[PDB]
Design a protein around this ligand. Structure first.
Ligand SMILES: *[C@H](C)[C@H]1/C(=C/c2[nH]c(/C=C3N=C(/C=C4\NC(=O)C(CC)=C4C)C(C)=C\3CCC(=O)O)c(CCC(=O)O)c2C)NC(=O)[C@@H]1C
Ligand SMILES: *[C@H](C)[C@H]1/C(=C/c2[nH]c(/C=C3N=C(/C=C4\NC(=O)C(CC)=C4C)C(C)=C\3CCC(=O)O)c(CCC(=O)O)c2C)NC(=O)[C@@H]1C
Ligand SMILES: *[C@H](C)[C@H]1/C(=C/c2[nH]c(/C=C3N=C(/C=C4\NC(=O)C(CC)=C4C)C(C)=C\3CCC(=O)O)c(CCC(=O)O)c2C)NC(=O)[C@@H]1C
Ligand SMILES: *[C@H](C)[C@H]1/C(=C/c2[nH]c(/C=C3N=C(/C=C4\NC(=O)C(CC)=C4C)C(C)=C\3CCC(=O)O)c(CCC(=O)O)c2C)NC(=O)[C@@H]1C
Ligand SMILES: *[C@H](C)[C@H]1/C(=C/c2[nH]c(/C=C3N=C(/C=C4\NC(=O)C(CC)=C4C)C(C)=C\3CCC(=O)O)c(CCC(=O)O)c2C)NC(=O)[C@@H]1C
Ligand SMILES: CCC1=C(C)/C(=C/C2=NC(=C\c3[nH]c(/C=C4\NC(=O)[C@H](C)[C@H]4CC)c(C)c3CCC(=O)O)/C(CCC(=O)O)=C2C)NC1=O
Lengths: 169, 157, 669, 161, 161, 157, 157, 157
C-alpha cells in the first residue's frame, strides 16, 4: 500500500514530467490538510466503539427484519460478526483518511471482499447502509469537535460503497 | 441520465458531442435545481402519496391481492408503490427515465407474472399514484413526473 | 478498482454443535471410521432421543406459562404477555393455490438479589418490552433446541458476549427472569430426576455463559508488515468445528505417538501415503522422534526435505504452485499477499526446495502456531479470523483437489488484484474459444481448472484487434488493423442474377462449386464431408438461380442440422452463442449487452431465432450486406499473439570513439 | 457507463433510500460545474486535431519510435498511434462531461495492457504521450478546466501503469 | 518428469509390450547423443550468466521495456526478468540433457502464461528474449548443439504463446 | 531413469548439474548397448522364465491361489510374472529401478491385499523368476536383474 | 431534422418515444424563434458574407482556380460559397447537420476532385466564410453556425 | 509479393496452386535478375533522384514546409523522398505494390495530416521524383516504377 506522498513521488518519475507545477500544487494542497487528517483519525480512534455501536443500532432500526428470525443479524453470533466487520470498515477508513490514498482500502479491505460476502451470504445493501451510517456519525462527531473543512472524510466511506455495491443503472 | 445518453449518442458515431447534444446538456444542467426541488418534494411526500393512491386504487380496483385481507400482500404492494415513487424521483434527478427503466421496468412483466400479480391492477395503481403525485406539484413540475409515471404504465402493458 | 475475483466457494459454517455432528467431525478430520467409543456415544445419544423429544415437547407445550413466570418476576405495572409476538405463518404466497385465477376477493369468506428493582412496563416502552418478551421466548426456544441437539453449544455460542448487547442495566433482571423460568420448567417434571437434571444443567449453562462480561476477541496478529491483523469473536470459534490437535510427548505410549505421527503424515502429505510409496526411511525418522532426539518441528522439516515430498508436491508442479502448496503443508494456510509469495519465490530461487522448507518451518509463525510438539493442523474458516484477499484461493487450497490444479491460484489473483479488467470474455476465460480456422475449442472448467472470473458489468466493451480484411470500398475507416493469416481483399461476393439458355462457358471470379465451398468453409470453418451437403442441395440451387441472396444462403447454412450438431447441440449455451457470433459476424461479441440480448433470445425462442437475430442485425447488413460471405474482421489479443510466434526481426540489438585516450588517469608518471 | 448523477443514484439505490443531503450537495456541485464542463468539451472538440498534433510533436516525433524499427514506423503504425491518441482524448472528454471515470474503466482500460503487450505497443511511451496530451489540454483550456481534464488523463495513465 | 528413456518405456508400457525395434533404435540414438548432450550442458553451465547478459543486450535493452512504465523498470523488475531468463536457460539445459520437453511443461510452462498475464509481463517480449537466447546459445556451443538446444527454446516460446 | 534422478536433484536444489553428476551421466550413456542387449535377453526368454519359475514356485509353494485348480487364477499369475519381467527389463534399460517402482511397486501391497493374494507367495515366485533369469544370463549382466528382483521382493516384504 | 432522428430512434426499437426523446423534441421546438432568426440573418447577409469571405480567401490563397482570371470560375466559386451558406442555414433550421450533410457534404471530396478544385483551398474559403458569418451573430447564436462550418471543413479535409 | 498473391489465391479456394499460377510463379522468378538490377539502379541513384526532384518540386511549389528556411524540415522531407524511393525498390523486388502499400501507403494521409504537411505538395513532390526516376531507366524497366509512383500519388489524393 501507498500513501499520497509516495504515490505522487513515484508518479513523478513514471510520467516523465518530474516535479512540475501541477505536482507541486497538488502536494501543497495535500500537505495543507495533513493536520486535519491526523485530527480526524484521532477522533475516529478515540470513539470507534461508540461509532460502530450507534451505526449498527441505527442499521437494525432501519432494517428490523435483520434481527428477526431468518435475518442475517439473527443470534448473537451474527450480531458480533456485524460489529466486528463494521469495526474493520471504520479502521481501514481511518487508515485511508490518514494516508490520503485509497490503496490501503484496495489492498486490505476490498480485495476479495465480494467473494467472501457471496460465499457467506452477507447482504451488500445493509453493508453499504452501515458504512454510510458510520460516515454520518463520524461527520457529526467531527462537527462537534469543531472541524470545518472535512470534505475528505467523505472520500473513503463513499468510495468503499461504490466498490461493494452492485450496478443498478 | 440524459448526460449518459448524450455521451453514448456521440460515441455511437465516434465523434465529440455535436451542438445538439451540447444544447441538451446545457438545458439539463440549467434545470438541475428544479429537478432537485421536485425530487425533494417526491421524497418528503412519498408516504401520503402512497396512502392516498392506495385508497383510490382499492376504491377503483377492489379485486387485487393488496385488497384480499392479507396484511403481508398489502404491505408489499405499498412498498412497491414507494419503490416506484423513488425510481421516478431518481429519473427526475437524472433527467431521463434510465434509472426507472434499469431498476424497475426492464423485466417488470416477467417479475410480476412470476409473483402472479395482475398487470392491469399495477397499471391502475400507477395511475392513482400519478394522480396523487401530480396534485402536490406545479404544472411545470408535474410535466416530467407524469411522463415517468406514463413510462411505468406503458412498460406494464 | 478491484475487479479481479478469486471465486466464491460454497461454504456452510457451523452455527452450533450436535452430538452426531461433533462425533462424525472428529472422526472425519482423522481420516478413519468411527471408533468403538464414538459409536457407543452415538448409540447412547440415539437411544435417549425419545426422552429428549418428550422433554422438549413438554417445555414447548408450556412455553407461554414458563415465559409468563419469567416475565412476572421482573415486570410490574402492566401485562408483559401483551408484548409477546408469536411467529406469523406466511399464507397466500405466490403459486400456493390460495387464490384461483385472478380472483382475490372470494378467497376470504428463589430469593431476589439484594436491592433488586423491578421494571415498570409503562415507562420501559413498547420497543424494549417487545425486545424483552421476545428474548425470554427465544431463550426458552433455544433451550429446547439444545435439549434436542444433545449439546448446549447453541446456547453457549449465543449467550457468551450477550451481556452488554442486552443492556447492562437489566442484566441482573435477565438472570432473575431466567431463574424464574427455570423454576417453572422444573415444576413440569417433578417426577424424573433425570429430565430435571438435564433442564437444570441447560439453564445453569445458559446463566453461567450469559454472565461472562465482554469476552475478549481472539486476535490474529499479522506475521509481517505485508499482512493485516484481524479479530474473531469467541462465539464464532465456539460454534465452529473443533480441530483435533495432537501434541507429541516423549512420555506417551507408543500407540499415542504413532497416532501423532500419522497426523503429521496426514497433514504434510495431505494423506498417509507413507506405506503406499514405500517410505522406508520414515522408520529412522520415527525413531528420532520417538526417542526424543528431534521434535515435531524437526520431523516436519525432514519430511519436507524428503524424496517423498519432492515426488508428491514438487515434481508435478511449477515453482509457483509448489510454493502455494507448501504454504498449506507447512503452515496450515494459504499465502496471504504477493509480497509473501515474492519472498518465498526468492528463497526457492536462491536455495531450492530445501531452502523453501526451511523458510516455512523456521518462520516465527510456525513456532507461534505449532511450537515444537504440536502437530501442524489446518487453520482457516472458524479457527481464526480470515482475510478476504485470499478467501477463494485458500478455500480451494484446503480441498483435497488442490494438488490436481497445476495453474497457480494465488500469485495470479494477487497480480490481477492490482490490474484493470482483463482481456477476456465477460463470462470468464472459459468463454473464449481458440481463434483457429474451425472447431469450437474452449477451456473446460473441470479439466485443468484455471478460471479467473472478473467483475464485468453490463456496459463493458471489449477491445478487439481489427484484421484489416474486406473489400477496398468497405475500408479506410478501420484500415489501420492488420492481423497475420488474414485474406485481405479475398472476400467471397456474388452479384445477384438478373428466355434463352446460357453459354457453355461463363466465368465469374469463383466458379459456382468454388463459391459454395467457400461459403461452407466460412460458415462451418471447414469443408463438410461427402454426403453432409445433401440436406442443403435445394438451398444451393436457389442460390445459383438467384432465388435467394448470399445472406439467405448463409442463414440457411447456419440453420441446418449439421451446424446445430457441430456448434449448438453439445456446447454450453453462451459458449455456443459466442462461437456462432464469431463465425457469422466475423468478430467476438463486445460485452454483456450483446451477450445478454442473444442469451435472452436463446432462452425465449431458441437456436433458430438466435441465427435470425445475428443475420438480421444491422451490423451484418453494414459489413456483409446481401451478397458477401462473412469473414473474420476482429481477433482478440491472445488470438493475435498466437499467430505471431516469430520475433527475430525485433531483436536487432542495441564506431568512432567519443574520447581520446580512454580509460586513463590524469598526470600519470 | 455511469455519470455523477447515476453514480449517486446507484449508491442511494443499493440502500433503498432517496438521495441523502450529502449526495444532493454533490449533485448540486455537478450541476454547477456543468457549464464549465460543456465549455471544456467544446474547446477540446474544436482543437482535437491540433491537440494530438502537438502531443505527437512534443512526445513522439524525432525519437527512435518513429525511426525504422520503432513502433511508430511505417504509415499504418503512425496512423494507429494517432488514432489511439484520438481515442484517449475523446474518451477523456466523455469522462469529463460525465464527471465520472467509469467510461474509461469499461471502454479504455479493460484489456488495454494485454492488447498493447500482444501488439508490442510501448506502454511507457503511451503513458508519456498521455501526460503530454494532458499538458497540452491544460495549456489550451486553462488551469481549472485543465486540472479537471487531467483527473481523467491521470486515470488513463494510472490504468496503463 | 520423464526423459527420453522413460518416454519410450511409457510408450511401450501403455500397450503392455517390450520395446519394439524402432523404440530400441530411438534409445540407441539417445545413448549415442548423450555425449554431445553432456558437452552442451557443461558449456551452458559455464557460460549461463554471459548467455543471459547477451540475451538481454540483444533483446530487451534500449527498448521501452527498460524505460519507466515498461515492465523492466526499477531494478527489482530488471532482476526478476533476469531471474526468469536464468530459469529458462537452466531448464532448457535440463530438457536437453533429458532428451525431451516434459520438465519444461511440468516446472515452467504450466500456467506461466496465466501468471504473466496477471502480472502484466509482456508475452511477446519474453518470446523475443527466448529466441535471442536460442541464438546466443547457438553462437556459443555451435550449430548442432545449438539446434538441439533451440528445440527446447522453441518449445518454451511456443508454450508461452 | 538415472538421468531423471540426476536432473531432479539438480532441479530441486536450483543449480546446474555438478561435475560428478555429468560424469555419472556420461558413464551411464556409455552402457546403453549393454543395457539394450540385457533387455533383449530378458524379452526373448520371458516365456521360458515364466514357465520354469511357475513350475518351481508351485513345487515350493503348492498352497497358493495359482495352484488352486482355477484356470483364470493361474493365467493371471503367469501374466503377472511376465509383467514383472517386463518391468525389470524396463528398469535395466533405464539404469534405475524407477520404471519398475512407478509401474508395479507403488501400492503393490494394497493391490495384492485387495486381490487376497498372499505377499509371501509373490515373494517366493519372484525369487524363482530371479533364479531362472540369472540361470540364462552372464555373471556381469546378472547384477542389475538380480538387484531389481530383490527390489520387487523387498517392496512386497 | 432532429425530429426525424428522434422518430427513427424510437422506430428502431419499435416503441413510442421515450421521455428523453420527448424532452429533446420539446427543447428543440422551444428554440424555433431563435433558429428562424439565425436563418433570416444568414439569408439577408448571404451576399455580404460571400463578398467579404471571397476577399479574405483571395488574400490568403492567390493562386486558386477562382482567382485565375476566369470570370466563370470566379462566379462558380462564389455561387458555391452562397450555396454552402444556404445549407448551413438549412441545418440551423433543422436543428442538425442532416440537411447540410445530405445536400453538400456526402461526396463533396469526389465532386471537387472531379472539378479539380484543391480541397485545402476550399477549407480555407470555408474558414473565411465562417469568420465573416460569425461576426453577424450574437454570442448565443454562433454555436450551431460555427459547428456546421466546422462540419463542412472537416468533411473537406 | 506476387508469390504471396498466388499462395493466398490458392488458399482462398482451399486448393493447390493451379498450373496457371505455377506458370505465373515461374515467369516471375525467371525475371528476378532484371528486378534486382532495377532495384540496384534505384538504390545507387537515390540521392541524385532526391536532389533533382526536390529542385523541380520547389520550383513548382516554393512555399512549402521543406522550403521554409528550416534545416530539419528540409532534411525530413528529403528523407521521406528517399524512403519512398526505397519502398518502390522493395515493390519492384517483390513484384507487387504490397511492400509499398503496407509500409508507406496505409494511413499516409493520417500521418501527413498529423504532421501538418499538405498532401497536394507531397503529390507534386512524388510526381517530380517519378520523372527523375524514370529519366534513369529504359521504358521496359520503368513500367513498374511508373505504376508504383502512380500508386503512391493516388494514395495521397
Ligand atoms: C490425424 C493425423 C490424427 C488425428 C486427428 C484428428 N483431428 C480431429 C479433429 C480436429 N482437428 C482439428 C484441427 C485443426 N483445426 C484447425 O483450425 C486446423 C488448421 C486448419 C487444424 C489442423 C480440430 C479443430 C478438430 C476438432 C473437430 C473438427 O473437425 O472441427 C479428430 C476427431 C476427434 C473428435 O473427437 O472429433 C481426429 C481423430 N487423430 C489421430 O489419432 C491422428 C494421429
Ligand atoms: C517532403 C516530400 C514533404 C515534407 C515532409 C516532411 N516530413 C516530416 C516529418 C516526418 N516524415 C515522416 C515520414 C514517414 N514516416 C514513416 O513511417 C514513413 C513511411 C516509411 C514516412 C514517409 C515522419 C515519421 C516524420 C516525423 C519526424 C521524424 O523524423 O520522426 C517533416 C518535418 C515536420 C516537422 O518537423 O514537424 C516534413 C517537412 N514536407 C514538405 O513540404 C514536402 C511536401
Ligand atoms: C501511440 C500513442 C502509441 C502507439 C499505438 C499503436 N496502437 C496500435 C494499434 C491498436 N491500438 C488499439 C487500441 C484501441 N482500440 C480500441 O478500440 C480502444 C478503445 C477505444 C483502444 C485503446 C488497438 C485495438 C490496436 C490494434 C489494431 C487496430 O487498430 O485494430 C498500433 C499499431 C499496431 C500494429 O502494428 O498492429 C500502434 C503503433 N504506438 C506507439 O509507439 C505509440 C507510443
Ligand atoms: C554511470 C554512473 C555508470 C554507468 C552506467 C550505465 N548504465 C547502462 C545501462 C542501463 N542503465 C540502466 C539503469 C536503470 N534502470 C532502471 O530501472 C533505473 C531506475 C533506478 C536505472 C537507473 C538500464 C536499464 C540500462 C540498460 C539500457 C537501457 O537503458 O535500456 C550502461 C550501458 C550498458 C550497456 O551494456 O549498454 C552504462 C554504461 N556506467 C559506468 O561506467 C558508470 C559507473
Ligand atoms: C524477462 C524475460 C521478462 C519479464 C519478467 C518478469 N517476471 C516477473 C515476475 C514473475 N515471474 C515469475 C516466473 C516464473 N514462475 C514460475 O513458476 C517459473 C518457472 C520456474 C517462472 C519463470 C513469477 C512467479 C513472478 C512473480 C513473482 C515475482 O514478482 O518475483 C517480473 C516482475 C513483475 C513485477 O511486477 O514485479 C518480471 C519483470 N518482464 C519483462 O518485461 C521481460 C520480457
Ligand atoms: C478487512 C477486510 C475483511 C472483511 C470485511 C472480512 C469479513 C468477514 N466477515 C465474516 C463474517 C460475517 N460477517 C457478517 C455480517 C456482516 N458483515 C458486514 O460487513 C456487514 C456490516 C454485515 C452484514 C450486513 C456475518 C453475519 C458473518 C458471519 C457469517 C456466518 O454466519 O458464518 C467473515 C468470516 C468469518 C471470519 O473468518 O472472520 C469474514 C472473513 N474479513 C476481512 O478480512
Amino acid at each position: 500500500m501507498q500513501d499520497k506522498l509516495t504515490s505522487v513521488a513515484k508518479n513523478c518519475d513514471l510520467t516523465g514530467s518530474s516535479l512540475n507545477r501541477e505536482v507541486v500544487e497538488t502536494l501543497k494542497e495535500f500537505l495543507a490538510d495533513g493536520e486535519k487528517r491526523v485530527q480526524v483519525a484521532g477522533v475516529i480512534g478515540s470513539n470507534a466503539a461508540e461509532i460502530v455501536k450507534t451505526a449498527v443500532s441505527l442499521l437494525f432500526q432501519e432494517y428490523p427484519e435483520l434481527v428477526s428470525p431468518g435475518g442475517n443479524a439473527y443470534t448473537t453470533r451474527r450480531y458480533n460478526m456485524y460489529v466486528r466487520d463494521m469495526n474493520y470498515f471504520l479502521r481501514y477508513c481511518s487508515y485511508a483518511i490518514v494516508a490520503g490514498d485509497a490503496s490501503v482500502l484496495d489492498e486490505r479491505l476490498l480485495a476479495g471482499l465480494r467473494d467472501t460476502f457471496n460465499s457467506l451470504g452477507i447482504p451488500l445493501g445493509p453493508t453499504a447502509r452501515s458504512i454510510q451510517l458510520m460516515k454520518n456519525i463520524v461527520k457529526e462527531k467531527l462537527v462537534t469537535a469543531g472541524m470545518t473543512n472535512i470534505t475528505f472524510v467523505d472520500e473513503p466511506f463513499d468510495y468503499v460503497v461504490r466498490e461493494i455495491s452492485e450496478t443498478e443503472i | 441520465s440524459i448526460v449518459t445518453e448524450l455521451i453514448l449518442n456521440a460515441d455511437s458515431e465516434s465523434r465529440y458531442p455535436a451542438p445538439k447534444e451540447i444544447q441538451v446538456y446545457q438545458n439539463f444542467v440549467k434545470t438541475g435545481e428544479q429537478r432537485i426541488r421536485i425530487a425533494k418534494i417526491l421524497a418528503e411526500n412519498e408516504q401520503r402519496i402512497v396512502q392516498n393512491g392506495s385508497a383510490r386504487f382499492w376504491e377503483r380496483v377492489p379485486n387485487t391481492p393488496s385488497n384480499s385481507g392479507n396484511e403481508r400482500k398489502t404491505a408489499s404492494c405499498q412498498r412497491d408503490q414507494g419503490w416506484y415513487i423513488r425510481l421516478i424521483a431518481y429519473s427526475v434527478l437524472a433527467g431521463s427515465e434510465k434509472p426507472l427503466e434499469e431498476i424497475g421496468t426492464i423485466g417488470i412483466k416477467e417479475m410480476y407474472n412470476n409473483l402472479e400479480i395482475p398487470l392491469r391492477n399495477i397499471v391502475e395503481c400507477m395511475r392513482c399514484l400519478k394522480e396523487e403525485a401530480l396534485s402536490l406539484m406545479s404544472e411545470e413540475d408535474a410535466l416530467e413526473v407524469s411522463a415517468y409515471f406514463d413510462y411505468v404504465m406503458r412498460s406494464l402493458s | 478498482s478491484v475487479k479481479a475475483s478469486g471465486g466464491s466457494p460454497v461454504t456452510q459454517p457451523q452455527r452450533y454443535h450436535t452430538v452426531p455432528v461433533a462425533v462424525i467431525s472428529h472422526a472425519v478430520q482423522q481420516d478413519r471410521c468411527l471408533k468403538n467409543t464414538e459409536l457407543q456415544e452415538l448409540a447412547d445419544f440415539f437411544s435417549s432421543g425419545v426422552k429428549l423429544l418428550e422433554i422438549a415437547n413438554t417445555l414447548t407445550q408450556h412455553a407461554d406459562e414458563i415465559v409468563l413466570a419469567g416475565a412476572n418476576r421482573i415486570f410490574v405495572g402492566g401485562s408483559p404477555m401483551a408484548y409477546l409476538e408469536k411467529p406469523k405463518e406466511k399464507i397466500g404466497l405466490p403459486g400456493s393455490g390460495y387464490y384461483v385465477g385472478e380472483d382475490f376477493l372470494t378467497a376470504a369468506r428463589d430469593p431476589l438479589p439484594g436491592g433488586f428493582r423491578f421494571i415498570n412496563v409503562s415507562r420501559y416502552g413498547a420497543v424494549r418490552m417487545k425486545r424483552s418478551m421476545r428474548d425470554l421466548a427465544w431463550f426458552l426456544r433455544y433451550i429446547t433446541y439444545a435439549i434436542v441437539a444433545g449439546d448446549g453449544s447453541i446456547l453457549s455460542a449465543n449467550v457468551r458476549g450477550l451481556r452488554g448487547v442486552i443492556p447492562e442495566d437489566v442484566t441482573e433482571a435477565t438472570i432473575v427472569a431466567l431463574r424464574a423460568m427455570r423454576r417453572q420448567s422444573l415444576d413440569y417434571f417433578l417426577e424424573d430426576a433425570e429430565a430435571t437434571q438435564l433442564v437444570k444443567g441447560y439453564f445453569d449453562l445458559l446463566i453461567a455463559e450469559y454472565l461472562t462480561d465482554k469476552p475478549s476477541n481472539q486476535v490474529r496478529i499479522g506475521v509481517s508488515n505485508d499482512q493485516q491483523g484481524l479479530q474473531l469473536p469467541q462465539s464464532y470459534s465456539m460454534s465452529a468445528e473443533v480441530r483435533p490437535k495432537f501434541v507429541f510427548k516423549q512420555a506417551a505410549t507408543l500407540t499415542q505417538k504413532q497416532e501423532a505421527i500419522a497426523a503429521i503424515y496426514r497433514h504434510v502429505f495431505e494423506r498417509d501415503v507413507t506405506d503406499t510409496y514405500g517410505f522406508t526411511q520414515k522408520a529412522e525418522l520415527e525413531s528420532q522422534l520417538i526417542g526424543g532426539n528431534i521434535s515435531v518441528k524437526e520431523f516436519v522439516r525432514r519430511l519436507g526435505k524428503s524424496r517423498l515430498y519432492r515426488r508428491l508436491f514438487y515434481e508435478p508442479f511449477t515453482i509457483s504452485r509448489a510454493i502455494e502448496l507448501a504454504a498449506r503443508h507447512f503452515l496450515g494456510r494459504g499465502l496471504s499477499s504477493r509480497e509473501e509469495f515474492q519472498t518465498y519465490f526468492d528463497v526457492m530461487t536462491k536455495g531450492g526446495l530445501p531452502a523453501l522448507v526451511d523458510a516455512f518451518v523456521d518462520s516465527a509463525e510456525y513456532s507461534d502456531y505449532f511450537g515444537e510438539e504440536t502437530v501442524p493442523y489446518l487453520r482457516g474458516l472458524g479457527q481464526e479470523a480470515q482475510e478476504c484477499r485470499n478467501w477463494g484461493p485458500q478455500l480451494d487450497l484446503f480441498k483435497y483437489s488442490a494438488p490436481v490444479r497445476k495453474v497457480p491460484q494465488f500469485i495470479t489473483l494477487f497480480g490481477s488484484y492490482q490490474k484493470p479488467l482483463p482481456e477476456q470474455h465477460p463470462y470468464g476465460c472459459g468463454n473464449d474459444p481458440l481463434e483457429i480456422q474451425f472447431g469450437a475449442i474452449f477451456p473446460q472448467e473441470t479439466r485443468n481448472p484455471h478460471p479467473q472470473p472478473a467483475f464485468f458489468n453490463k456496459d463493458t466493451r471489449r477491445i478487439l484487434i481489427g484484421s484489416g480484411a474486406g473489400s477496398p470500398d468497405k475500408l479506410n475507416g478501420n484500415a489501420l488493423g492488420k492481423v497475420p493469416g488474414s485474406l485481405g481483399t479475398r472476400v467471397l461476393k456474388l452479384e445477384p442474377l438478373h428466355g434463352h439458355q446460357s453459354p457453355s462457358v461463363n466465368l465469374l471470379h469463383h466458379s459456382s462449386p468454388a463459391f459454395i465451398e467457400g461459403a461452407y468453409r466460412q460458415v462451418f470453418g471447414r469443408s463438410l464431408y461427402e454426403g453432409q451437403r445433401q440436406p442443403l442441395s435445394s438451398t444451393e440451387s436457389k442460390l445459383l438461380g438467384g432465388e435467394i441472396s448470399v445472406r439467405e444462403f448463409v442463414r440457411q447454412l447456419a440453420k441446418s442440422k449439421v451446424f446445430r450438431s457441430l456448434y449448438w447441440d453439445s456446447l454450453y449455451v453462451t459458449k455456443a452463442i459466442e462461437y456462432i457470433h464469431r463465425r457469422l459476424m466475423g468478430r467476438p461479441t463486445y460485452g454483456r449487452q450483446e451477450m445478454n440480448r442473444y442469451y435472452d433470445i436463446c432462452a425465449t425462442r431458441g437456436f433458430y431465432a438466435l441465427i435470425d437475430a445475428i443475420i438480421d442485425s444491422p451490423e451484418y447488413l453494414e459489413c456483409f450486406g446481401e451478397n458477401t460471405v462473412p469473414y473474420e474482421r476482429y481477433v482478440t489479443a491472445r488470438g493475435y499473439l498466437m499467430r505471431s510466434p516469430r520475433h527475430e526481426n525485433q531483436l536487432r540489438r542495441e564506431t568512432v570513439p567519443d574520447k581520446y585516450n580512454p580509460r586513463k588517469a590524469n598526470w600519470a608518471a | 457507463m455511469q455519470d455523477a448523477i447515476t453514480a449517486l443514484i446507484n449508491s442511494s439505490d443499493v440502500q433503498g433510500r432517496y438521495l441523502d443531503p450529502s449526495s444532493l450537495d454533490k449533485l448540486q456541485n455537478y450541476f454547477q460545474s456543468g457549464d464549465m464542463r460543456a465549455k471544456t468539451a467544446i474547446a477540446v472538440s474544436a482543437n482535437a486535431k491540433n491537440i494530438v498534433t502537438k502531443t505527437v510533436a512534443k512526445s513522439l516525433l524525432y525519437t527512435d519510435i518513429t525511426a525504422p524499427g520503432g513502433n511508430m514506423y511505417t504509415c499504418r503504425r503512425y496512423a494507429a498511434c494517432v488514432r489511439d491518441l484520438d481515442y484517449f482524448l475523446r474518451y477523456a472528454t466523455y469522462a469529463m462531461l460525465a464527471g465520472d471515470t467509469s467510461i474509461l474503466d469499461e471502454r479504455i482500460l479493460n484489456g488495454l495492457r494485454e492488447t498493447y503487450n500482444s501488439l508490442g505497443v510501448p506502454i511507457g511511451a503511451t503513458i508519456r504521450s498521455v501526460q503530454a496530451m494532458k499538458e497540452v489540454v491544460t495549456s489550451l483550456v486553462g488551469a481549472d478546466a485543465g486540472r479537471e481534464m487531467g483527473v481523467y488523463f491521470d486515470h488513463i495513465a494510472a490504468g496503463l501503469s
